[PDB]
Design a protein around this ligand. Sequence first.
Ligand SMILES: O=C(O)CCC(=O)C(=O)O
Ligand code: PRO
Ligand code: PRO
Ligand SMILES: [O]
Lengths: 262, 268
Amino acid sequence: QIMEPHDTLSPAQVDEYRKNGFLVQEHVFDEEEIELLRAEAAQEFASGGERVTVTGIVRGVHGCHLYSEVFGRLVRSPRLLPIARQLLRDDVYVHQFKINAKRAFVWEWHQDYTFWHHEDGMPAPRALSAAIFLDEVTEFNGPLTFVPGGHGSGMIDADVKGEGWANTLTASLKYSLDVETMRGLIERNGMVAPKGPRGSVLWFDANIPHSSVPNISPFDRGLVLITYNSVENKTDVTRGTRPEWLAARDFTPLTALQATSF
Amino acid sequence: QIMEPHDTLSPAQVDEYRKNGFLVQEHVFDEEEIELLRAEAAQEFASGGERVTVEQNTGIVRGVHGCHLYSEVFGRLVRSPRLLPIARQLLRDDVYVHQFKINAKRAFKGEVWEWHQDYTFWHHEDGMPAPRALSAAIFLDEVTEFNGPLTFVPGGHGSGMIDADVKGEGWANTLTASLKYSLDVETMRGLIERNGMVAPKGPRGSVLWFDANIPHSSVPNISPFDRGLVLITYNSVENKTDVTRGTRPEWLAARDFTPLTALQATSF
Ligand SMILES: O=C(O)CCC(=O)C(=O)O
Ligand code: PRO
Ligand code: PRO
Ligand SMILES: [O]
């Protein structure tokens, strides 16, 4: 049995990711694969307990690669792992895994690294996220939106609206970026909401500012977001404040799935 | 503590490797790193017992095999961030060590390596099912025209297995001056008349990457200079050898196919 030999990004793709802070690869996973991932997402939303977040409809579920065999395999996929290694220039592990159901009918502006630095003791922004598109992403179903090049600043200041971690994944975020700071970033660099078909992968930098608007449209915008971190960049578990299913503590380097008879 | 971020080959470098079947990177390891490896090699030649091979005319050391299984230093080298990411890159897979050897090719007494493709050996002796493997040869000494450099047929890997005459049952003569698989003389001449021969040179600490199927040879060293090479053969995990058709011990042909991970920088 055989897996396709590992594909990595071209030098122009790597340049684009480094310059913009994001990159889309279209049609990484096929329809049948996506539908497997959608079924498992639905299982996780149904049975995830305290790892589910909520009007009261599912907003997200966290940590599923620790609890689902299917998602545990996904993060080792040869479509994903080799690019994560290549971009981070290290062995890698999963810092965070989440499925953000942007149901058919806000995430405020933020840099992920800001969260992971302060909540989890991530020492440098040497991490990224791969967002797998379970639905077509269009202009109308609340696409992730970025300030391109906005990661080159580094961490940007934000008020800490909370003395807990409950508000880290609510509509009102613990470390939101203010209107004055964003207006500046946006006037300088612009805003971009990358689009793509079901099965695409959107890669984005831990430090890139991003947001998404409410989805009142008729279509869902399900994303599976896998955050890969450099093993060298492992979080300081002594500054960590969160459960495992938000901030991993097993730093074992990931290895790629091989083709087996089962 | 910080390891330098993993460096991979450029697209030009990869293209050169695929087209020629070999590639030199100069100055990968520094003198002090090489000296550590030289000292460990000397330990392995002194204590490897049955894993050590000697030259026939004289009894001086020819080779030692499997050291990554027995030396911690050599166990870490194979995981080095200077080596592992390139092997992963070139084999487009996770990888493991099929074979590890140190070929000492001393100053005046070092003997021939006749023309051979490594893959021919690994396929028939060890059950490697495709040539999706490569060797990284670390230069413990400057390799020059005169100290018996590995010599290749550039592009000679792109015909698969070439036809060889087999000498005997068993495997002792896989490591000798006269090899169990010797190449057909007219096919050799034809290969060479169309592709030429090249002996890559380079300073101490270089790495010479070469394809599992590239024809290669080396002459005796009559310089007053050693040519110690540490040869690490990485194989694709997908391409793991079929251990049911395997005829040799573990220190010639690995059985543990666990994918390798890179060394990190720790406080010890
Ligand atoms: O449409 C979505 O929100 C993606 C699919 C999903 O999250 C689910 O199957 O429950
Ligand atoms: O708390 C966290 O880590 C995730 C990622 C940024 C917003 N919510
Ligand atoms: O027997 C082997 O495996 C090595 C490679 C060719 C010569 N000796
Ligand atoms: O080799």
